[model samples]
Target: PISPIETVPVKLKPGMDGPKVKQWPLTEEKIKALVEICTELEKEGKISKIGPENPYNTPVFAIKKKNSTRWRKLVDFRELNKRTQDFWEVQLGIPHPAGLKKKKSVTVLDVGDAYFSVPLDEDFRKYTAFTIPSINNETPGIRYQYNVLPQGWKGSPAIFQSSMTKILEPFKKQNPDIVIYQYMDDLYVGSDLEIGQHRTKIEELRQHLLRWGLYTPDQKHQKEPPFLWMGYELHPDKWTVQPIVLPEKDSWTVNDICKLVGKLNWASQIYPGIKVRQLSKLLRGTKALTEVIPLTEEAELELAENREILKEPVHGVYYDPSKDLIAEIQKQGQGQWTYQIYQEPFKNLKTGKYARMRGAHTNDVKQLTEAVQKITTESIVIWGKTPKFKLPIQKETWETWWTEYWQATWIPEWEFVNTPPLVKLWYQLEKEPIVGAETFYVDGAANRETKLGKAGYVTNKGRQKVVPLTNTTNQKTELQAIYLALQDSGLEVNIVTDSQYALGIIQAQPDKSESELVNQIIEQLIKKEKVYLAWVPAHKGIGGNEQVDKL
Candidate 1:
């Protein structure tokens, strides 16, 4: 016999006249299923035929089960959900994946219809009433409401989570070795102890839930090394939390992109590297279902990158520059700096030394110069140490230089000499040809207050002008010319520009506006089969360069 457990009193929003009712159309099949479920609930004492004629009357509906002929009954309390406020006094944060690390064994339990197992006060039950079609001719247009806590209510989750927390308090206190994480109906239990102790604790948890009239089905009892909970897979090996792989579709519209971004945003708490902001930008002006927003090339690339990142485990160590080991720096000479480890020394693979080291020189001296100007010895510190290293003042610089020097100079020589044929072949494919190539001449002109930029492209078909925008500097005007060229045409193209500043912005950081423009251009480039940004000397009589300079 399932009896309702006591629940917290629900308070309605202020000035709400009794209850609000909503009407929904139902089919004959749905009517039968709804009545059948309600009759069963009445037998279990979960609902009563007689009510206080509460003013709030929500509609009920039925949904077909996957691969089954049966339909599950559901109540739509969306209106009531708006009126009910969360009154939970306790502040319980959701469990982090990092908490499950080092556990030898884990067991996850789920309560069936957990919300219905909790009881609602008689005063509030009237607000949850819903009308269904009459089963017989005897009583027509009759309605029924839940006496127990109903599903789909706004306050249900808070009430259920609070109840489970109080019920599990004694179990958590008694067995310090066992760790528990609960989110509503689901309870995750784990321990670093041997299998015997883990089994005993799981049984104890089972009996405790049963005592509270919560039924934990045998199929829901999962005892395994890698446990799935709250959209994350918790592995016992490293206690790492990996996101469940979301199903992929051939294409997406505005709503699809919005849903994907929402899921990524939620998972970002456990996996912070998931690119939520970039994906969210895809849905900027989405207002209707007819508004079809396709995934940009950069968005697709990020989706692939996020898939790989989700597979990798998040280590417990994180960078906190304030508390960890510090580094002391010394300036040797012009463009030369030596770094001394003030605390624990990390192993240097190249030198096979664990002490002080000199900074390696690169073709680009801009970063070394900036580091010399900025970062002080007192500023360097390691918090939670991880393999990913960050220079105090800069983001990843590899992408900046990879195109100019690293790929042409270092990558080819190293791959041929050191890497296997299979690896070398993989790199060869990365240097593939561009498709649907076109050439564009871009130029910019600016005075103190006004600025102008233009991009002209010549093809066998015809010549066209790429439009430009205002309120920009001369350097930004030059970049804007290229930006317009990229946006105007989706085909692979070569952009010929005279300004080095415009070209350099691609490889280095830019001002906020310039960054947005450059990022947009990069996104277009990523979508194209191939793209080339070439530099030609200005006023040198070169065909395209001279044409753009004249503009």
Candidate 2:
């Protein structure tokens, strides 16, 4: 009624020797044959040892390499799982949380939330919600049912991630100067400049999102670090533990120790001074306190002292301390050498084996305390004196030496802000122009005779002051008018223009052999901080630049 048991022979291969062999009994000769083949293979090699071998006791699987020196063995725990609930009940110690160790200064592009419910259809069903059309020639004859929110669907997280990625694509493609990384809702966009260029990039990204029909709110608290996303609080310096998830350490168990011993048995390395028989005893009594404590040379000497203490005899004539206190006191002053020399070290020994014997009390707390004090005192006498080391100073300094060192070394990589070109522009002899007024309102019309080579200005009262210009294009006419306006203002100024042509002309005018008026204007502007130019995308809804243009 029962299957016959089987036994298998384990043999070692030459140049592939290991520590020991284990035997197993199974159900058939076929199982024995499989076990024999497993044993004859390289002892160090890890493979699936099925059948009579019952290899699940030391579960290991080998990974064969294509063009490599050795194979890898991945641990398997099926047998242990089937035998006990240790894996489920065991508590692993705490694990260190994940985060950036050092501080990082990044340009964060907070593109607002993506709008949903944009539908696709031939009749433009985007305006209507929850509208379904009848199946026709364009649509499938047997239409499969679909819902707005389906249960157990796999595409939710992916769709959300894709929406965020689409919003970042244009800014990423256009600006090669900045580096960006996005994880779900939060985006880190950064540049080397520490100034307000970071803020400019953020505003640019926000505007781009608005154009794409996404709405972003101005929440100052949300804009600052440390930012939160997908339940993780990502601080600028590092990631901290939140209530959602905490890291834990590896667990300890009986099977874990057995697995360790199996590896140690396979590796031929022996624990020093521990015989195989003693090791067997220690393994069998693993739950015992003395078995867990490692044996040392000092331990052997302490045992010898313990044996000596046991050999002493107790006299039949015993005095009771409570009743015969006067008699005990009389015996104490009998002689100078009355105290037992053996018991002297047992009571007051501060070093060596004798000290260890007295300290080895049954109570662990008392024993450990005495052992520590004895060992420390002994080590002090052996080493002679304690070593000295200096501690670092922790004060801040404001000297030039300190400042240079702080700039060159102390300032972290994340703290660096980008510096831009700085220049001041000044004007020469000109008529007095009204402040905060648009000198030229460059408009197109037929009655005004506003041809290509013409210029004019509109006053606060909407009156046009017509003037003449050489260049035909609107851009050239605007530049010419800007030159005349600066001269008329008769004040030192800094020109912040987005025009490359104006900047180039101002920079190259002095070197060229053209009319001296252009060079003279540049020279006077140079007397102030010269003309500073910054290139910003024009007429794409830049509020500050649009306001200045209207003026």
Q: Which candidate has the top score in TM-score?
A: 1
What are the Cα lDDT values of the candidates?
0.57, 0.33
Tell me the number of clashing residue pairs for each predicted model.
3, 13
List per-candidate RMSD values in Å.
14.4, 37.6
Q: Give the TM-score comparing model 1 with the true structure, all chains together.
A: 0.53
Please list the residue runs of candidate 1 whose C-alpha ends up more than 4 Å from where it truly belongs after superposition: 1-5, 87-93, 135-138, 219-221, 239-551
Candidate 2 segments exceeding 4 Å error: 1-156, 220-223, 245-551
Evaluate model 2: give its TM-score: 0.22
Q: Distance (Å) between predicted and true CA of 221, model 1? A: 6.8
In model 1, the Cα lDDT at residue 296 comes to 80
Candidate 2 Cα deviation (angstroms), residue 188:
3.5
Residue 7 lDDT, candidate 1, scale 0-100? 58
**Which has the greatest lDDT?**
1
- Tell how far residue 529 is off in model 2, in angstroms: 90
